[PDB]
């Protein structure tokens, strides 16, 4: 891999080790729900510090973006590079003790995905990719599935909003209803980055979600493109990071899933 992807990978590993070590005290701390959520914010910030420290040791002039910290611009040539970091994808799973969550690290050069790490530290699954270098899971070269249609497909989605609102719920369930009929299953495991990784690995045949922020999609999107898959927003265009709505799949199941949800979209998602 590129030295840059190796540094992203090593960062993701250190953060995942700290997050992994952090899940034990939760069931002990879980008795105070608000104090438990405060603790998870603190674990997330410790994970962000671990990632940023490792990245900035190799590239102190790069720009960095996170949910909480926002955009910190670079300097010189480094102004062109942007690290998009989600230190813990699947915070609801994490607070409940559900072992399915991940560190997510993307590197963008002039707005285009260059490098991606999605790291499951419980299963110790390291998903990696660089633009034009392909995708891998623990060093095994990854490829999207061969499935030709939604019949007998396994699809993923989520509902990533921090409150259950009826407009988002109605539109979400409209699409869900329309998408059940044929599939071998529909999966809601609760971490967008792992869903996109699973499409890249051939474990899922397609994935769709709206309401996502860039840090939840960026790495998974490169994994899927480098796996020979397709990624778009709900209009079929390439602004999934900016719009928050994404369809990702193998080529055929991507097209069928994108076409299937259009009749159910409000103009908001068009």
The annotated binding site for Mg(2+) is made up of: 67, 86, 88
Residue 187 CB contacts under 8 Å (≥ 6 apart), including other chains: 154, 155, 156, 157, 195, 204
CB of 1 to ligand GDE, least distance (A): 27
Q: Per-residue string for binding with its own copies, 129-168, x by CB under 8 A?
A: --------x--x-xx-xxx----x-x----xx-x-xxx--
The rounded distance, in Å, linking the Cα atoms of 141 and 127 is: 10
Per DSSP, what are the bridge partners of residue 120?
125
Residue 231 CB contacts under 8 Å (≥ 6 apart), including other chains: 221, 224, 225, 238, 240, 246, 247, 248, 254
Contact between 209 and 117 (Cβ < 8 Å): no
Taking the CA of residue 221 as centre, how many other CA atoms within 13 Å lie in the half-sphere pointing to its CB? Answer: 28
Position with the least CB separation from ligand GDE: 158
Strands 140-141 and 102-109: unpaired
Q: Quick one: which of 65, 107, 192, 257 contacts ligand GDE (CB under 6 A)?
A: 192
Token pair in block for residue 30? 């879980």
Sole window of 65-73, 95-103, 180-188, 222-230 interacting with ligand GDE (rule: CB under 6 A): 180-188
Strands 112-120 and 154-156: unpaired
Token pair in block for residue 234? 């709900």
Contact between 130 and 114 (Cβ < 8 Å): yes
Q: Which of ligand GDE, its own copies, none has residue 147 at its interface (CB below 5 to 8 Å by kind)?
A: its own copies
DSSP state of 69: T
Taking the CA of residue 63 as centre, how many other CA atoms within 13 Å lie in the half-sphere pointing to its CB? Answer: 19
CB of 195 to ligand GDE, least distance (A): 5
Q: Which of its own copies, ligand GDE, none has residue 152 at its interface (CB below 5 to 8 Å by kind)?
A: its own copies
**54 vs 257, which CB is nearer to its own copies?**
257
CB of 62 to ligand GDE, least distance (A): 25
Does position 96 bind ligand GDE by CB under 6 A? no
Q: Which of ligand GDE, its own copies, none has residue 137 at its interface (CB below 5 to 8 Å by kind)?
A: its own copies
Does position 159 bind ligand GDE by CB under 6 A? yes
The rounded distance, in Å, linking the Cα atoms of 56 and 64 is: 9
Does position 205 bind ligand GDE by CB under 6 A? no
In the window 39-68, what residues touch its own copies (CB under 8 A)? none
Q: Using CB under 8 A, list all residues that contact its own copies.
A: 27-31, 33, 92-93, 95-100, 122-123, 125, 137, 140, 142-143, 145-147, 152, 154, 159-160, 162, 164-166, 169, 173, 176-177, 180-190, 198, 201-205
């Amino acid at each position: 891999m590129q030295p840059m992807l190796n540094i992203a990978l090593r960062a993701a590993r250190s953060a995942g080790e700290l997050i992994f070590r952090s899940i034990e005290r939760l069931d002990v701390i879980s008795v105070n729900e608000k104090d438990a959520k405060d603790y998870v914010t603190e674990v997330d910030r410790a994970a962000e510090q671990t990632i940023v420290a490792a990245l900035r040791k190799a590239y102190p002039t790069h720009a960095i973006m996170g949910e909480e910290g926002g955009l910190i611009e670079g300097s010189g040539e480094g102004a062109d590079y942007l690290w998009v970091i989600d230190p813990l994808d699947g915070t609801t799973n994490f607070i409940h003790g559900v072992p399915h969550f991940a560190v997510s690290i993307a590197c963008k050069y002039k707005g285009r995905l260059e490098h991606a790490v999605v790291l499951d530290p419980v299963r110790q699954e390291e998903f990696t990719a660089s633009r034009g270098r392909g995708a891998a899971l623990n060093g095994r070269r990854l490829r999207v599935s061969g499935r030709k249609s939604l019949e007998g497909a396994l699809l993923g989605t989520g509902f990533p909003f921090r409150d259950n609102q009826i407009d988002n719920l109605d539109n979400y369930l409209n699409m869900f209803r329309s998408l059940v009929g044929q599939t071998a299953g529909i999966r809601r495991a609760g971490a967008a980055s792992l869903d996109l990784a699973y499409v890249a690995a051939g474990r899922y045949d397609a994935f769709w979600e709206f309401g996502l922020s860039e840090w939840d999609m960026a790495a998974g999107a490169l994994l899927v493109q480098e796996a020979g898959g397709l990624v778009s927003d709900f209009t079929g265009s390439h602004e999934f990071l900016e719009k928050g709505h994404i369809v990702a799949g193998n080529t055929k199941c991507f097209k069928a899933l994108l076409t299937t949800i259009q009749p159910h979209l409000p103009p908001s998602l068009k």
